[PDB]
Design a protein around this nucleic acid. Structure first.
Lengths: 607, 119, 181, 399, 525
RNA sequence: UUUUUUUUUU
RNA sequence: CGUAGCUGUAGAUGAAUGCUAAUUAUAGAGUAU
RNA sequence: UUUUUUUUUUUUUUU
RNA sequence: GGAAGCUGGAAGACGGAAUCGUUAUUAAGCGCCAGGUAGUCCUGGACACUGAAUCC
């Protein structure tokens, strides 16, 4: 302390770090509550209000249990969710009775959402709902944005540090305290990334994968009639009213607030301090996810490259023992951003790949089985990755998806050469024989949505796919098409293909299948059974796009039309049936494009 | 408070240039064309050579020179007292821009041909 | 092509100098309807156009120091109607003009439309197999709502352009320009 | 200190603050401190979130020098000047050479002297002495210890203009002189090629000699062999001639060598571009009505160049504009020198920070009685703005 | 600064980037055109079709681009030299307006115009040459040194232009004359300038005396990697005396200063390419260092392929034999090297050596071939090198593919001449018929026939052949046989020039009917 | 009651 | 829209606006000091 | 709307 | 006849006395145009904003 009666200025030199180490579910918490029941009871008009309601919930929590729904389906809707959320997580002749109970919980969980959204939750109930979903890994793209506003307005409220705890007993047995002030400050880093990495897109967003779509901007269409027309003598009409009714056209619009972005900015700074602390590898994955944002952080401040550079510097200097297990999540997020310290970071991550596969037995099937399981559920907390692999029946069904996305991540880079040609052949051959024994059935078939993610990377990195076609003979045509038609006029054809991308969404409209035709064209790049199978695949996918080739995005239409008038394409497809007259239709709409040189991009010249 | 241009920061007296970055009011337009009379006369190829004395730089700053500039500039902003309401004066830059571009007068910043525009 | 034209809309406007005269026209126009060949008769929309007024001033008896004044009010009335998809020109133009009564003039506004290249494409869709390897109200327009929205937007665009251009060419002493002489 | 401590007030000693900031308080804080009746009360400054993001960048920049760290200045746009009262004192306490200038316009709207020259840059002998005198109040004990390089000895003119740029003004005068003198050699065909080339060769020989004899720049002959940068006392002695040459010499010296971290902070940077109160005959018809632009002077021009921040190998610059001296309007940031990725746009105070500000004034016996019932009521009135909050509560009893 | 770039990962692999930024370019603002152009510069793959689209639209949108914008756009053309016949019309339409007496534009404009096609006399040369000769009184020291490299690459110069820069350095260097002030400031500005003018076989009396070292005792001038400039300047027609003060130095005769693996072998090798010098008895010591350096694994996959390609010419200066060191002693498991970046460099090296083997004693003299077994070993390397390029063919830039065609067509002559296994598929699919962005050639302005010119597809990517002059003009010991089938002087350095010239004559006879061709057009070294 | 820009400053 | 709020000057003992070698606009013509 | 703005208000009208 | 630049030492700080009247979006200030069939008023007609007090 200084002699003037103040704090020494030398103390305020550096910035403190953040914790967020502990993380527990809602399972063990309930067990402790049921034990410390006799000790929790030891604790003006409002005196009775805060006691009467406060004890009734304690005895009930352990609205007649998990039965008597529908009729019952206010804090009633909030407490009910806890019972269902905690019951589902318990899992993580015997298959008959278990299925009956499992199905009921899932059906009831969704039903409670309808009533929950119809009423605006308070500050005392918004956090509980959000926290429960994270533990159970059941988010909603429609409900998440609504609940995010409540957590923000109350956080910055004047009565934040002075106000006491919420009266649900949930906060009594919690490490943090001081109501919402410090509760969010000690939030696990795993859950902090959700706020930053929140999708704010609406359902109308379809101009990226589906195709063209004109959005309306004039719902109300007020038109007069003969029975409700104002009389000619309008002067006397005003004198026959109690008060002024008609007024000049004055309407106030709605202005969007931060919508939770104000709180997200504060959370981003916490991850920066948790880099130079030499923490665990699992805890450090959350920092990369926040820094790899694309719609919230934007580029306002010049802190994104600085934080990324520091993260890479510490990540590079680490042992291979702790880095080998964590390779899919780190590489998936780190490949979404470009920085100067990119080549040096990726070189280290590539070396460990050689030893990881060799030690796992990849070119004694138990070694490769257990390794994949840990990378699919244990490692990824709540992430949703290429093709929606997110946190085995016979053979090579789940491990294939993990390996499929890994290759695409390394080929995504835009700083230097992805990898060596020798590595590509070794990697390709690694999965070549693995996919051969993938059960040549059921709904557990590799859909086109995840298939297109791998094919997209090879179409931009300048690497040609190998001659191997075994991957194309175990996907798409095999069961993804025949099964669709088996399960339950000119205008009828259009609805048949349209129904495919309605609920299950086997493909991303014109996003994933768009590159499928282009890749099959270029494959055998040189030219003076592979030939037979190529013709069947091209024709099958072509007839499924032609009927709906009127409402698609212009950029997507060019690619489809471009990859038909080529030497590699099969003959008797460009005849005067559906393509000859349809070609001039696109040219008339966009005459500015090249007409004579249509087949110049990927025509008879290949590339 | 008492800003020039009003609430909408109106500017009905300035003309922009396509080339470079330089603007001036119509007041300086008269002086520029008169000063650069040698270039204009030689471009086309006594009664014709009547404004030769006005090309002097010092003569413009004298009492006689001050009156000559004011005579040509009629102050278009000022008009009749009955020109009220919808009958309000508009920007006269439309006429000035045509003459400034047709006369092929060089810009003070960079020597260029007709490049002026309304703005 | 002349044969390819069609009356898109017909805005019918009225200008009456009396309250009773304007009311008579509305009743006459309604009576002319509900008598055409088609099931639903053409039901135009209503659009009042306010009521302009004028009243000059004069000094008031002569040989006075302007102690009193006498005003003479001259009110006016207006009415506008809208039409859409006028398939029958004889059953609409004749009805509008035949509904007049007294000193009640009219001012129509025709609106034609020409179609370009008729879109004719999308032949019988291809098909293959796996390789196995009414509601019409009484007093309402029968035309679709989508057509009205497309045509209504065009009218609002022309009005804005005309007002902008008209204001530019509006100055005292036409033909006078600065430093022209 | 950290993310947990946001929006708190840090006590500062009255005596210590004066020594750390000899020039004065940063911004309009002087108007709020005089309202406190107690003379022995400390001064508090709120720690806004905008300071935490900026403070972290400086920490990494210092550790690197012992391409990851930033090597360019920032810009605060939109309480932008409030952070200056906390960022400058903290940096100075960490052995950082900080250039303080909260009122740079004082040298452009006050009584002074101007002398036109061929370089076209007006100088101010009266204001040139005050720049160094005020800077040495607290930055002493370090400039003298710092050495001086030999590669930048005396290549600056009297008005601070470089030798290469100053001699260009005389190119027109010398061009006509050589044209008239060429008749001696022009009047003495041979192959029609070599005869013309030989005549042109004479121009190169004469031009080289003419560019090194007519011009006689002053290479600070008063100090033949310097030893340090703070030992230039002759600048303070002579003011009629040696007033601007020494000012620019120190500015260039603090770019080449790298021994200590530096920092420059220029407040109210939005009033340096507009016209000044001076009068001259340099107007472009009606562009200035016979006025000298502020950016055309010597001192304002020195602090009106952000694109040169790359040459600062020791530190970086920073500026902020929050006052109402001129309407910001569009305020184009692309045609000024800064980029869209280096602008920190702050927002109004949050409700959490608003409560602390009101409570802070209570401890100072500023307000009479502020009931908690109306605490949130006043938030909507002033809208939470700092300028509207202090003024509204000062006029009335508050609450 | 801290560079950063974000990818369009909204849907994680939706759409096609090459196609997305294709249609929008047809209708976009002038500012957006420049932003999209920079994307292709830093892109991995190159689309020849997209290059032509941007060039065509540039001419139409040239009415709103500011002078600074035109210079910035032209600067991006430095890499991967590419141009179109419509591009010259756009730049010529605004170059005159850009003449505002610029100090630095004299170099930036000239350097950018050096490549592609320029030197147009009555459009571009007249204003540039007239404005550069009269502005010699304001050139900076840095600009003058850079201008030397520009004039050297020009063809068919004029006496007034060459003499303008010759006298500029004499006066400029004198000022600095009266250890870092001379060792890196005085000598550097002397040998660098002399080499530039020496290319045009031009020299004056008041430059040689001053450029040479007056004092013979002035040792420690430049290191091993800079002294070659003085030697290259001499040995042209009658130059001597500059080499060594009496052919006895202290740092350029006893294995230079010091040669080692410490980032020194590559530097010397790189300097021998752009300098026309033959490895004499003293300069041949570099080849011996390769034997030991190649043993190390690190040097085998870091600089081995780069050194072999950059010094393939002059076989008896780098390699003991054409097949001995060019074989694969341990390359069976080490052939792969960064996918294609270094693998393609081996293909070109194997092609140039083939030409030297044939044209040694079959009517060219100057040596003799080796035992027939040498050809057998050489074929074993090329066969296993071309296959690896099939899957990596799409990972090559425009410049990488342009030079590949020259080395690819060579293998199609010896094989059929009376062999390679993959000569019927890889060599007859794309390597034989390429359609990459063809740049314009570098033609002189001596003929003065720019009013009747055309273009024909062949090996040199474009040529000058108009319809009116079709098949009609451009189409003793060192002149009889060397000026006939060879048509290449042993100035420049012929090993590369002979290969390119011979292929051009054949390509113009197989497809097109063009007889009575007068090659000439030999650029300086 | 009044703002920079087509480039020649270590 | 005007007195705005805000904010620089002199917290005016000295802010009165007519007199006229001289021009702006309408009109066929309003001219001479 | 933490990559949003950068700001006083009139005498007929969104039928 | 209207307005404007320049120039400026036209006549006035007298009188708390006295005569003209306002029933509050009254009174007191400030700003705009419609007609007077080229320009051409400090009056009359006509709209809008700030808007206090007394025993009436």
């Amino acid at each position: 302390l200084l002699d003037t009666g103040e704090i020494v200025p030398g103390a305020f030199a550096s910035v403190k770090k953040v914790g967020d180490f502990p993380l527990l579910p809602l399972s063990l918490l309930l067990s402790r509550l049921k034990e410390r029941r006799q000790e929790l009871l030891r604790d003006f008009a409002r005196e009775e209000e805060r006691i009467q309601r406060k004890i009734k919930i304690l005895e009930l929590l352990a609205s007649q249990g998990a039965i008597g729904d529908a009729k019952r389906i206010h804090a009633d809707a909030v407490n009910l969710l806890l019972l269902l959320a905690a019951e589902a997580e318990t899992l993580a002749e015997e298959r008959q009775l278990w299925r009956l109970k499992c199905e009921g919980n899932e059906e009831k969980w969704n039903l409670c959402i309808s009533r929950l959204k119809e009423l605006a939750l308070d500050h005392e109930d918004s956090f509980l709902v959000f926290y429960a979903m994270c533990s159970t890994n059941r988010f909603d793209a429609v409900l998440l944005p609504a609940l995010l506003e409540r957590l923000e307005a109350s956080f910055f409220s004047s009565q934040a540090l002075s106000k006491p705890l919420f009266h649900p007993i949930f906060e009594v047995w919690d490490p943090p305290c001081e109501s919402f002030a410090a509760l969010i400050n000690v939030l696990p880093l795993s859950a902090k990334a959700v706020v930053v990495t929140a999708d704010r897109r609406s359902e109308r967003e379809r101009r990226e994968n589906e195709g063209w779509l004109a959005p309306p901007e004039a719902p109300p269409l007020v038109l007069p009639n003969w029975q409700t027309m104002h009389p000619v003598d309008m002067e006397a009409w005003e004198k026959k009213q109690r008060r002024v009714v008609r007024t000049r056209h004055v309407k106030a619009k709605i202005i969007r607030q931060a919508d939770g972005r104000k709180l997200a900015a504060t959370m981003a700074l916490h991850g920066r301090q948790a880099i130079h602390r030499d923490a665990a590898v699992s805890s450090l994955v959350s920092v990369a996810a926040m820094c790899a944002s694309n719609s919230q952080r934007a580029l306002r401040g010049e802190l994104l490259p600085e934080t990324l550079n520091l993260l890479a510097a510490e990540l590079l200097g680490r042992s291979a023992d702790a880095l080998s297990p964590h390779l899919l999540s780190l590489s998936f997020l780190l490949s979404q951003s470009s920085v100067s310290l990119t080549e040096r970071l990726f070189l280290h991550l590539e070396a460990v790949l050689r030893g990881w596969l060799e030690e796992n037995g990849f070119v004694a099937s138990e070694k490769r089985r257990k390794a994949s399981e840990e990378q699919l559920r244990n490692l990824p907390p709540g992430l949703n990755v290429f093709g929606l692999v997110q946190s085995d029946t016979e053979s090579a069904l789940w491990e294939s998806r993990v390996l499929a996305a890994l290759l695409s991540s390394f080929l995504r880079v835009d700083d230097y050469r992805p990898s060596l040609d020798f590595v590509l052949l070794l990697s390709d051959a690694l999965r070549n024989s693995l996919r051969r024994t993938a059960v040549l059935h059921e709904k557990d078939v590799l859909s086109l949505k995840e298939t297109g993610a791998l094919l997209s990377s090879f179409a931009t990195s300048g690497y040609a796919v190998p001659p191997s076609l075994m991957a194309c003979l175990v996907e798409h045509f095999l069961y993804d098409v025949d099964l669709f038609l088996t399960s339950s006029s000119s205008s009828s054809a259009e609805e048949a293909e349209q129904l495919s991308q309605s609920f299950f969404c086997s493909s991303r409209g014109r996003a994933t299948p768009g590159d499928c035709a282009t890749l099959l064209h270029s494959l055998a790049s040189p030219s003076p059974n592979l030939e037979k199978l190529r013709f069947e695949a091209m024709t099958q996918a072509w007839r499924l796009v032609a009927p709906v080739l009127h409402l698609l995005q212009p950029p997507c239409k060019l690619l489809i039309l471009n990859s038909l008038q080529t030497a590699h394409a099969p003959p008797d497809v460009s005849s005067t049936a559906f393509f000859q007259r349809s070609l001039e239709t696109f040219l008339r709409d966009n005459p500015d494009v090249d007409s004579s040189l249509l087949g110049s991009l990927f025509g008879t010249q290949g590339r | 408070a008492r800003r020039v241009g009003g609430i909408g920061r109106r500017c009905f007296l300035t003309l922009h240039c396509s080339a470079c970055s330089f603007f001036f009011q119509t007041s300086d337009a008269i002086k520029l064309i008169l000063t650069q009379q040698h270039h204009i006369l030689r471009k086309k190829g006594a009664s014709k050579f009547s404004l030769l004395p006005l090309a002097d730089a010092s003569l413009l700053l004298k009492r006689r020179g001050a009156l000559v500039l004011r005579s040509l500039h009629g102050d278009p902003l000022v008009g009749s007292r009955r020109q009220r309401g919808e009958f309000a004066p508009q920007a006269p830059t439309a006429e000035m821009a045509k003459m400034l571009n047709k006369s092929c007068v060089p810009c003070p910043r960079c020597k260029r041909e007709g490049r002026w525009e309304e703005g | 092509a002349l044969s390819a034209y069609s009356l898109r809309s017909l805005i019918v406007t009225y200008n009456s100098r009396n309250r009773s005269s304007m009311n008579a026209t509305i009743e006459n126009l309604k009576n002319a309807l509900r008598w055409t060949s088609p099931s639903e008769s053409s039901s135009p929309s209503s659009a009042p156009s306010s009521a302009p007024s004028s009243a000059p001033s004069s000094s008031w008896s002569p040989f006075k120091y302007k102690y009193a004044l006498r005003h003479y009010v001259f009110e006016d009335h207006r009415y506008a109607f809208a039409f859409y998809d006028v398939n029958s020109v004889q059953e609409v133009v004749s009805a509008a003009l035949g509904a007049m009564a007294g000193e009640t003039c009219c001012s129509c506004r025709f609106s034609w439309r020409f179609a370009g290249r008729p879109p004719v494409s999308l032949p019988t869709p291809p098909r293959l197999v796996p390789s196995s390897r009414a509601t019409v109200l009484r007093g309402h327009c029968p035309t679709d709502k989508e057509f009205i929205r497309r045509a209504l937007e065009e009218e609002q665009a022309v009005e804005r352009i005309r007002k902008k251009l008209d204001k530019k060419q509006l100055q005292w002493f036409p033909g006078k320009t600065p430093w022209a002489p | 200190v950290g993310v947990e401590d946001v929006g708190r007030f840090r006590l500062f000693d009255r005596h210590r603050l004066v020594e750390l900031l000899p020039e004065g308080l940063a911004g309009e804080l002087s108007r709020d401190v005089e309202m406190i009746p107690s003379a022995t009360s400390p001064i508090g400054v709120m720690l806004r979130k905008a300071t935490l993001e900026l403070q972290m960048q400086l920490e990494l920049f210092a550790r690197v020098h012992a391409l990851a760290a930033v090597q360019r200045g920032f810009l605060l746009d939109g309480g932008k000047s409030c952070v200056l009262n906390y960022l400058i004192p903290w940096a100075r306490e960490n052995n950082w050479l900080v250039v303080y200038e909260p009122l740079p316009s004082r040298y452009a709207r006050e009584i002074g002297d101007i002398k036109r020259s061929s370089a076209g840059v007006y100088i101010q002998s009266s204001f040139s002495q005050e720049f160094l005198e005020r800077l040495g109040r607290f930055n002493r004990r370090l400039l003298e210890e710092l050495p001086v390089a030999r590669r930048c000895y005396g290549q600056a003119a009297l008005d601070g203009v470089h030798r290469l740029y100053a001699e260009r003004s005389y190119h027109s005068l010398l061009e006509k002189a050589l044209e008239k003198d060429l008749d001696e050699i022009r009047e003495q065909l041979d192959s029609q090629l070599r005869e013309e080339i030989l005549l042109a060769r004479e121009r190169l020989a004469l031009w080289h000699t003419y560019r090194r004899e007519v011009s006689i720049p002053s290479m600070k002959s008063r100090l033949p062999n310097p030893a340090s940068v703070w030992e230039i006392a002759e600048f303070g002695l002579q003011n009629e001639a040696f007033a601007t040459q020494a000012l620019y010499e120190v500015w260039e010296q603090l770019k080449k060598q790298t021994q200590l971290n530096v920092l420059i902070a220029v407040d109210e940077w939005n009033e340096c571009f507009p016209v000044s109160e001076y009068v001259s005959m340099r107007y472009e018809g009606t562009r200035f009505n016979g006025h000298i632009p502020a950016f055309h002077l010597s001192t304002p021009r020195l602090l009106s160049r952000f694109d040169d921040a790359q040459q600062f190998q020791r530190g970086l610059k920073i500026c902020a504009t929050s006052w109402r001296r001129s309407n910001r309007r569009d305020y184009r940031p692309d045609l000024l020198g800064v980029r869209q990725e280096e602008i920190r746009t702050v927002r109004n105070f949050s409700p959490l920070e608003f409560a602390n500000f009101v409570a802070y004034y209570h401890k100072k016996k500023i307000l009479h009685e502020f009931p908690r019932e109306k605490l949130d009521y006043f938030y909507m009135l002033s809208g939470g703005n700092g300028f509207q909050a202090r003024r509204l509560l000062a006029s009335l009893y508050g609450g | 600064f801290s560079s950063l770039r974000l990818s369009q990962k909204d849907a994680r692999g939706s759409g096609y980037l090459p196609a997305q930024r294709f249609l929008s370019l047809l209708k976009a603002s002038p500012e957006e055109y420049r932003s999209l152009l920079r994307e292709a510069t830093q892109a991995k793959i190159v689309d020849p079709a997209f290059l032509r689209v941007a060039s065509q639209r540039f001419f139409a949108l040239s009415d709103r681009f500011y002078p600074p914008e035109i210079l910035d756009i032209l600067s991006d053309f430095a890499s991967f030299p590419y141009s179109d016949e419509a591009l010259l019309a756009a730049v010529a339409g605004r170059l005159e307006d850009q003449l505002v007496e610029p100090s630095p534009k004299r170099l930036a404009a000239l350097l950018s115009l050096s490549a592609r096609l320029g030197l147009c006399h009555p459009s571009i040369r007249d204003p540039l040459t007239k404005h550069i000769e009269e502005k010699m009184y304001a050139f900076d020291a840095a600009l003058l040194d850079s201008l030397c490299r520009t004039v050297g690459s020009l063809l068919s110069p004029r006496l007034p232009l060459l003499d303008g820069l010759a006298t500029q350095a004499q006066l400029l260097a004198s000022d600095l004359r009266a250890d870092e002030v001379a060792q890196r400031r005085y000598i550097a500005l002397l040998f660098r300038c002399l080499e530039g003018l020496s290319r045009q076989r031009y020299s004056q009396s008041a430059l040689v005396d001053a450029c040479v070292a007056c004092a013979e005792q002035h040792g420690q001038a430049f290191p091993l990697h800079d002294t070659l400039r003085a030697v290259a300047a001499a040995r042209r027609l009658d130059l001597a005396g500059i080499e060594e003060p009496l052919r006895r130095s202290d740092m350029a005769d006893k294995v230079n200063r010091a040669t080692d693996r410490g980032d020194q072998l590559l530097a010397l090798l790189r300097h021998l390419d752009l300098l026309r010098l033959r490895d004499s008895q003293l300069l041949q010591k570099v080849s011996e260092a390769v034997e030991l350096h190649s043993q190390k694994a690190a040097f085998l996959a870091t600089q081995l392929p780069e050194a072999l390609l950059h010094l393939t010419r002059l076989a008896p200066a780098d390699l003991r034999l054409p097949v001995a060191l060019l074989s694969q002693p341990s390359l069976l498991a080490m052939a792969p090297r960064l996918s294609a970046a270094q693998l393609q460099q081996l293909l070109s090296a194997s092609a140039l050596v083939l030409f030297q083997h044939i044209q040694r004693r079959e009517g060219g003299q100057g040596g003799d071939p080796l035992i027939a077994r040498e050809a057998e070993a050489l074929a074993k390397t090329v066969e296993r090198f071309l296959d690896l390029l099939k899957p990596q063919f799409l990972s090559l830039n425009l410049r990488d593919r342009r030079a590949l065609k020259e080395a690819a067509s060579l293998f199609l002559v010896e094989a059929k001449g009376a062999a390679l296994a993959p000569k019927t598929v890889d060599f007859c699919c794309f390597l034989e018929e390429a359609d990459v962005a063809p740049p314009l050639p570098l033609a002189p302005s001596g003929g003065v026939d720019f009013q009747s010119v055309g273009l024909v597809e062949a090996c040199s990517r474009l040529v000058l052949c108009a319809d009116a002059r079709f098949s009609e003009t451009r189409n003793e010991t060192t002149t009889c046989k060397l000026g006939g089938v060879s048509t290449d002087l042993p100035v420049s350095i012929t090993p590369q020039a002979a290969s390119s010239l011979l292929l051009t004559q054949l390509a113009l006879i197989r497809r097109g009917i063009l007889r009575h061709e007068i090659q000439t057009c030999i650029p300086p070294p």
